[PDB]
Amino acid sequence: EPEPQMVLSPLTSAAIFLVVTIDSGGEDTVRDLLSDVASLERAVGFRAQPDGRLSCVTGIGSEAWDRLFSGARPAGLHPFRELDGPVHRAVATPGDLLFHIRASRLDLCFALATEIMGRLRGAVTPQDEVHGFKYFDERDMLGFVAGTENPTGAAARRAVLVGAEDPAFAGGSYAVVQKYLHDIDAWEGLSVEAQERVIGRRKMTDVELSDDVKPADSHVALTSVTGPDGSDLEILRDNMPFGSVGREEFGTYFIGYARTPEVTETMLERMFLGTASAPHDRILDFSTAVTGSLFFTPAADFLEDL
Amino acid sequence: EPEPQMVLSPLTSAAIFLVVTIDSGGEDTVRDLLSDVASLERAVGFRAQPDGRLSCVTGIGSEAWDRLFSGARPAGLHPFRELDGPVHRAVATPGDLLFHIRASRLDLCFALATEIMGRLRGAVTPQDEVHGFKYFDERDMLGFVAGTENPTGAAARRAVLVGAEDPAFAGGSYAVVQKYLHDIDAWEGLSVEAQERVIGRRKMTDVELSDDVKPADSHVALTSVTGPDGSDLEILRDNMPFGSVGREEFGTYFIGYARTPEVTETMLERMFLGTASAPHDRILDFSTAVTGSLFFTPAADFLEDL
Amino acid sequence: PEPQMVLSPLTSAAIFLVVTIDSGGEDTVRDLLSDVASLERAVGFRAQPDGRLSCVTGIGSEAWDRLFSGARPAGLHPFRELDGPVHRAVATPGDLLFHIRASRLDLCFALATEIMGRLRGAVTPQDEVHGFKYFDERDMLGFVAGTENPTGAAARRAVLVGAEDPAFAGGSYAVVQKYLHDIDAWEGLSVEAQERVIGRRKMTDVELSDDVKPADSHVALTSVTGPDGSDLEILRDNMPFGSVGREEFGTYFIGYARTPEVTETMLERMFLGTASAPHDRILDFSTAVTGSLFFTPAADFLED
Amino acid sequence: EPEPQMVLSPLTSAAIFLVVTIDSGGEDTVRDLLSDVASLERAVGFRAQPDGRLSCVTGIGSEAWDRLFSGARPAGLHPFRELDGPVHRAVATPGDLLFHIRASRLDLCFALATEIMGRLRGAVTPQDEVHGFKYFDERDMLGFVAGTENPTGAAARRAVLVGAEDPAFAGGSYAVVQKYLHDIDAWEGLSVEAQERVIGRRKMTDVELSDDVKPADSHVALTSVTGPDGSDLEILRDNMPFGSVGREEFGTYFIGYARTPEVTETMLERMFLGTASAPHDRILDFSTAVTGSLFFTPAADFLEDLS
């Protein structure tokens, strides 16, 4: 049975997201680092266990894959597709490698980031670095609980991990990232009731709005998708607030894992392009995407063997 | 007894340092915020007690004092004094207000910073914003334990709080801040034993080097100061690592509190200008100061009674 | 099939809610059942990982026939009243059980509030108990409670319906009884006399050896062996409760099993006695004031 | 300095409030129990330290004081004064002894309540027993954070503990209790902004409303009181949710400690009788007081030195 990366992590209150491009000639250095990244994760994290909860999920973009590896490609790997909606746009931005670093403390994330980037200096150019922090009651930058309807247990494994449909890549996953900046002033001018109509859940109690009252352009309504057999299509999300008070930057860093990118891409199409009943996701009236990238996160043993 | 701000805080693993200047006409907005800052600290922090450990210490610079208040000035308040040493320089940079925000989690620091800056928008210009994180075993960016010889209990109160020498300002303190960037590549080229000779303490065990082995230009030797009667002159420090892996920025944010700025200024003169036996503090061969400011942190009731 | 959270980690707080379904309340009940897992997530998620909030939902025999058509679970029937020579196990009404557990009573209460909010006008409350465990896992009699519960695979095999009733695989059967204790009479016994009642040492929680353990001790009467000589096991999560002002000092008994026959055989031994034991000596200090049986379906049964 | 009881406790998530009356002839049994209550607190609590945080504050009503003790009375002790407002009433109900029992866990509260009541059986009649639990984010039954503006440290000592003004009773305090039941249906029919105008603070963030927006009949405006010199008069509160979902009982148990009952009584008068600018505290349109009692909580050494 192939060993996945730590895509299914315990709850963590801190994260670093690192997106880089691989410079010309940097391929060999990158391959060496990939074969050591799990041993660096253990080195940094083991002595802080059990409370540290340090993990690193490593992802590779479509164009980078062809530069690094010969043989088969993962079936669903392609560049992030830009969505040019009537009002809102989901931009595509460059990224060859993702490091999704999570722990209970930002310092542990930083120590691992420092070791990873130390080995890659001269081979990569940083595109994005975000230091994320979750609020103490699992709330996001909009004041709502984040993570409630994530799948757990076997339902999570089924939703996230590549299996028999792409057997050479079993135990992998696909990550989509988007960095969002919020208009906090406009958001906080809404009443709580109007915010609940945007999200589709109660703010304080986190109870879902009933079907008869939930707006068709609420976030929860548009990101609820049923498959060909009427089962729910699910993804696993670990959105993280970030910001700078001096620069008035108040953000949500979105990351979503799925067994195939088609699930995530269908959700994004509904959000940005809308449906028969909804012009677009009302969350986008307060949130602007400034990055967008797609990565394949291979099985841990795939990385170890190169 | 006047009530001090939370200068003597429990150990915290997260901090935000905010330094701002007061714009033309911003005085009244600032005074209103100062009279509310303790109540904002309670609002953000109380529901996360007892583990949150959220506090905010507010400081006011020399020039800002005269713009905000009439009547007496604190006796020791003056602008930061630039030190132009033979090799190393301690720069002065602008700052009218300091907010030293501490907690066990960065999100609580950020929430308070957001409320404070929300009330000040349009009245202040940000000069510096640093998000600090301490390593899980109380280590700093150089890999040494940080805080070991800080005073505690009654010795700390005596060292930090203004008393009968300046009775109108009893329960206040003086804060000096400097942001340092490290040359980590050069530091990590030293052996552990060579690093220990720079600091003056063992790296793994944090035991002080004996007087016969401790170099005269070690950090602990230069920052050890005796008064006219041979008593130790002490300050309270809460130095915090910070940085950005993508920008190769690895820093220490220095903050030191003392009952009179003369103690901290004597330490800085020994570090930057040296003594008969030491050209300068060897820590400065790996650390460059890029900011420097001095603030008076009044008793909490002084702020409240505006 | 995915079970409900019958096998929970240890919790220090609980709310037990038993209700009857009023005439015309069926539809409101069915709607709540299809939402109960989503309400559990909504209340519990923001207090993770320490909250450990869960809700196990059970349905009685008479209620089942009112709510659902098609197959019944094979073992579902009303609680059987036991009229012993001295002690009686009463049957009391109950159509739905909510067994709510967490590390803190406030989280239990928040979920109970949301559940009862959705059911108002459709149900009548029969019982509500707010349970608390003592800091050293002791019960109201001063003994450690839960020691011999099965764990891991043995727990799954003992508690979850399987291939013997395949349409209801992943379900379980819950028996509840509320007991009030005579604490004055109990505390008049020596520790050694109490140990002979229970069958375990009080301070150290070591089982009394076979040569000293009385036949009418609680542990001896609730030890039952199957056709192949294996132990028949149940999973228990007994909770203290009470009111100091009313001198009410209680144990809320709940036992889960794959078939109610195991639990019912234990109860018959306790209340009716055997050739070797008049009755369970624990019953000389404990009176049952409720008794109900529920089937707790697989979580996916409720969600559909 | 005389030693207070644990009036200023760390934050606790569980409480039991026990109010009893002393039966005729029960005085001697009561006095014996009072001289042992500290030792019972240690017996129950010590083996659960450091996490248990078990404490018991013992209070004695005005009429009970006269029955138990033959010497001088605390200067501010009198029976709770009923407030008969144009709309709302603060009832006075019987109570001779208060046991305010706090810990991190309800079982530790219950163990101590059991030991106390075991010694008093036959000498007292129970009037009220409430098992309180705090919501995990310090919220009350109305969904608002409770405790935010309580004084801390030296300001709390100065506000709560009797000093030089009544030297024989230094280290004591005065407790007012009221059990409130809420109309949760009516409350949940308000918008969040309408709730915020009732309380005087933002619901989600717990930031106080500006002076320009905060209504005169908000709870925070009516319970804000300044003294003869313009200093704030403060009390220490440890309000606790309680209830029963089956009976639709959703409550707040109010307890407030103060160095003199006059501060707490002034706040209650403003709430129930109103001011020039406010008919009454709007929180009372959603909250009914069903008990009301006043107690003196003596210094610990006063209790220990008894026959």
Added chain:
Amino acid sequence: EPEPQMVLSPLTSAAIFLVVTIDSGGEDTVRDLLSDVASLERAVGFRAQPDGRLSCVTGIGSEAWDRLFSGARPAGLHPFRELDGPVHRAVATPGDLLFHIRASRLDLCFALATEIMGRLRGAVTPQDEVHGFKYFDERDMLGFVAGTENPTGAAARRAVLVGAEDPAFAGGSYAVVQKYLHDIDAWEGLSVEAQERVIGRRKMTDVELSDDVKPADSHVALTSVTGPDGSDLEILRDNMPFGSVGREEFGTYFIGYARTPEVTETMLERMFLGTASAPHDRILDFSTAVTGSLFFTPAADFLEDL
């Protein structure tokens, strides 16, 4: 105010008790270590704060005091007085220095013991070393709660710290130690009710037996002492279980702190020699003392000024 050592510590679950004798010629090495012991405590303990709660109380015996120091001596300092009762004996055993090391974890105790003994190698001979552990519910090796009636707060300071009666030594205390081994087989032959009559408290609930049932030769009755003016004479105890299962050694390490040794010695006399109404403390029928030593624990600043 003179600063005491950490005689009144928060609750700790681990301890090391180290008793040594000073070898001929070892005086100078010992004096140097004493002047450094608080700085060693900070070095070992700081990086495990706030939960470590590492402290070291240092005591000096009567004969050692006269070897190390000249001039005035603490008023009550003498060698432990052997008690030769009709049945039971309290032995005096050699000991010049006590290190009473406490923390929430044994490893912190061990690290500090290692540093202390490292500085003293060649100057001292070990007489006793005990590694103590508390049971999870504060119980001792007899199964009873230990520590319940210790004084707290102000009453503890008054009972333990030397004051105006010996002003040159204000802020000190006197420690008596005795290592006890228990005859667990004999003890476990009693019923619980018979055990309770030995101790004077209920076993499970730790409620004191009422005056009408408490025997005169119970442990709590013999260790309850009133002074000529009616006040309770109290000591502070931090008894620790210890043992070795293979050697069937089950013990209690007794340590009692008091402002004068007269209080502790009066308790010991009542235990071992008895009263008019009690032949001896019944706890001694199941407990044998194998060490006995007395130490003065000076104010912290006395040690620092060497």
Added chain:
Amino acid sequence: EPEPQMVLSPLTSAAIFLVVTIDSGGEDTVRDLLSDVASLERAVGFRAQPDGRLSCVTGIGSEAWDRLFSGARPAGLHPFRELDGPVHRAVATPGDLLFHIRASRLDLCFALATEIMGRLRGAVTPQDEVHGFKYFDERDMLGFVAGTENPTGAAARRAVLVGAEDPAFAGGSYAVVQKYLHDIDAWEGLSVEAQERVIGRRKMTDVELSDDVKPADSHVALTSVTGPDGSDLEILRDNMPFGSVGREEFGTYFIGYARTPEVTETMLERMFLGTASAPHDRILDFSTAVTGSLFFTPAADFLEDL
């Protein structure tokens, strides 16, 4: 179907290792105790759950197996093989039963050890008893992190548990124990860099030395072993510091579990007897083995069915 003992335990900060021999005639008493050991574990441990994490792993030696049981032997069970190297020796010492007791607190370990030894008095002779404690940062007595490269999850199950190759004993494991005493004086005379060359990892950061610099006689190089198919052969280790400061005993108690003893024995041979490129493991120049024994730890159901 078979239920293993708790070989794969969560991390624990305390342990007791008890090794006994079975006296002539003690076999029946031992068999009775083995059938009850799981129920004693529950009795002691249940009331401290969920934080106690008390477990006991029971092992049986080769000669004891033949005295206790008839029918099949586990295929790999034999007495520990003495290794007589040119410089260093791995001695074989007597041991019939191992009790490897772990918990979050030493109290719980001690209570269970007391109950076990209580049942076996008169049937067994203690050979070794060690009370282990972890340093707060997972460090050993040499100052290095211990446990970093242990297998986890499925890789741990595959490495440790007997399966289809010995089907009657599926769910069992083999334990090798050695008690080591260190020469701490000689070790602390090395520079940190010289220590790192002994171990094969960086001291402070726990990063493995790269292949070009790692010495062939480093500990990590000699204990890295590849199988016939090029896979890494792994074991699960739960080494625990122990000691006595007064006797200058500073130790590491080695325990290693594996599905077959040949893996552990190949590592030992490389350490003690060396390779073409390394005379012996350099860790042995600072570490002396004073015990050595091998045990089979059966499935839990094997013990219960006695």
